[PDB]
Amino acid sequence: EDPSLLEWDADDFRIFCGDLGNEVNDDILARAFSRFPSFLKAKVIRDKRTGKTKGYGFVSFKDPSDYVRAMREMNGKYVGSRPIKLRKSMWKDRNLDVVRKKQKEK
Amino acid sequence: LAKWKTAEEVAALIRSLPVEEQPKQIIVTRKGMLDPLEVHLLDFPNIVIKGSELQL
Amino acid sequence: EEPIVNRGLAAALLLCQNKGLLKDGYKPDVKIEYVDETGRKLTPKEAFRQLSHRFHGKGSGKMKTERRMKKLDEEALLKKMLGTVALLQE
RNA sequence: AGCUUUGCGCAGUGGCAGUAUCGUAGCCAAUGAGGUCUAUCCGAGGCGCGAUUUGCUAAUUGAAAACUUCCCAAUAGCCGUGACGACUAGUCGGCACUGGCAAUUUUUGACAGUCUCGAGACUG
């Protein structure tokens, strides 16, 4: 329950961009988001006291159709030093886990 | 192909049952049926495909 | 066909056997076994995986941990034990 | 107004799927493709090339098979023994245990089974 998703979650589309350079794409994700029509957020998941990114990052785009089009265009696009693979963010929270448990028994 | 279809039907009947109802030991009456049953049940290695000396 | 007789331990042992449920100078009993925090004996692959995880300093991911926990729960449920519904439906 | 048809699309059940399902941008084709039966007869595409979207779940391998700081340590009985204080060598109250606590009155169990109308009887 890390309090970090309260700044980018605004009923938008979250895209998980992985397979990126560990020592690269620190702020290049921001450039990609700015290129994207929504240009809302391009947060990169990194570990504290590590000096490098943790891999996949969360790009929040307000426009859903624009986010889908960008994901189609940027799927496997060479960003930084490695092609970034874009997929859908999971966001499995405690309420989501409880709902999944309720739907599993029924 | 008929033995493979029978082994696939046995594997589908095993997979249709839940994990609490799935058996862990299979007794093959025919001797020429345990050989595809090891092939058709490769997703469940916890089951034992054993032969039978007494034919029911 | 042997029932559990009262005040007798040989009948339960027979039922379990029928069911198939069974220098200084010294002889040091050097016994080496692999166990876990749950106390269950570990397979050599599992013991090697635990040793490698402890040596590398990083454990398994959240998804792998959840899958392992679900598998352990399923194994516990299976080891703890639709005919009536099939008899009533027929 | 009730009813019905052809064609079409949506939805749904069931079924099929490598002699199956399509693209074809190549060519030919009702101005006739292809025909061993019915040939002064039938009437549609045929031939080459090239294919067989998306989500979920599970399992295997591997140290790790990918979703947002993790780890480590700690907190949230009795009998006697040595001192301390009190009351007349003895007793009492608190402190820690350098030894013991499965042999009749308390904690290492004389317990368990059967039958009858809360109670009684039988056996090991």
Curated annotation (Swiss-Prot), chain A:
Ranges for domain RRM: 13-91
Position of the signal peptide: none
Compartments reported by the entry: Nucleus; Cytoplasm
Self-association and partners: Interacts with HNRNPK.
Function noted in UniProt: Binds (via the RRM domain) to the 3'-untranslated region (UTR) of CDKN1A mRNA.
Family, per entry: Belongs to the RRM RBM42 family.
Name of the protein in its database record: RNA-binding protein 42
Organism encoding this protein: Homo sapiens
Phylogenetic placement of the source organism: Eukaryota, Metazoa, Chordata, Craniata, Vertebrata
Whole-protein residues included: 369 to 474 of 480
Swiss-Prot record, chain B:
Known role: Plays a role in pre-mRNA splicing as core component of precatalytic, catalytic and postcatalytic spliceosomal complexes, both of the predominant U2-type spliceosome and the minor U12-type spliceosome. Functions as a scaffold that mediates the ordered assembly of spliceosomal proteins and snRNAs. Required for the assembly of the U4/U6-U5 tri-snRNP complex, a building block of the spliceosome. Functions as a scaffold that positions spliceosomal U2, U5 and U6 snRNAs at splice sites on pre-mRNA substrates, so that splicing can occur. Interacts with both the 5' and the 3' splice site.
Implicated disorder: Retinitis pigmentosa 13: A retinal dystrophy belonging to the group of pigmentary retinopathies. Retinitis pigmentosa is characterized by retinal pigment deposits visible on fundus examination and primary loss of rod photoreceptor cells followed by secondary loss of cone photoreceptors. Patients typically have night vision blindness and loss of midperipheral visual field. As their condition progresses, they lose their far peripheral visual field and eventually central vision as well.
Cell compartments where the protein resides: Nucleus; Nucleus speckle
Entry comment, domain topic: The MPN (JAB/Mov34) domain mediates interaction with TSSC4 and SNRNP200. Has structural similarity with deubiquitinating enzymes, but lacks the residues that would bind the catalytic metal ion. Contains a region with structural similarity to reverse transcriptase, presenting the classical thumb, fingers and palm architecture, but lacks enzyme activity, since the essential metal-binding residues are not conserved.
Any coiled-coil regions, as ranges: none
Lineage: Eukaryota, Metazoa, Chordata, Craniata, Vertebrata
Name recorded for this polypeptide: Pre-mRNA-processing-splicing factor 8
Gene name linked to the record: PRPF8
Coverage span on the entire protein: 1836 to 1891 of 2335
Tissue: Widely expressed.
From Swiss-Prot, chain C:
Expression sites by tissue: Ubiquitously expressed.
PTM comment, free text: Sumoylated with SUMO2.
Places the protein is found: Nucleus
Glycyl lysine isopeptide (Lys-Gly) (interchain with G-Cter in SUMO2) crosslink site(s): K19, K31, K45, K71, K80
Assembly and interaction partners: Identified in the spliceosome C complex. Component of the U4/U6-U5 tri-snRNP complex composed of the U4, U6 and U5 snRNAs and at least PRPF3, PRPF4, PRPF6, PRPF8, PRPF31, SNRNP200, TXNL4A, SNRNP40, DDX23, CD2BP2, PPIH, SNU13, EFTUD2, SART1 and USP39. Interacts with UBL5. Interacts with IVNS1ABP (via Kelch repeats).
Entry similarity comment: Belongs to the SNU66/SART1 family.
Free-text function comment from the UniProt entry: Plays a role in mRNA splicing as a component of the U4/U6-U5 tri-snRNP, one of the building blocks of the spliceosome. May also bind to DNA.
Identification of the protein by name: U4/U6.U5 tri-snRNP-associated protein 1
Native species: Homo sapiens
Gene name per UniProt: SART1
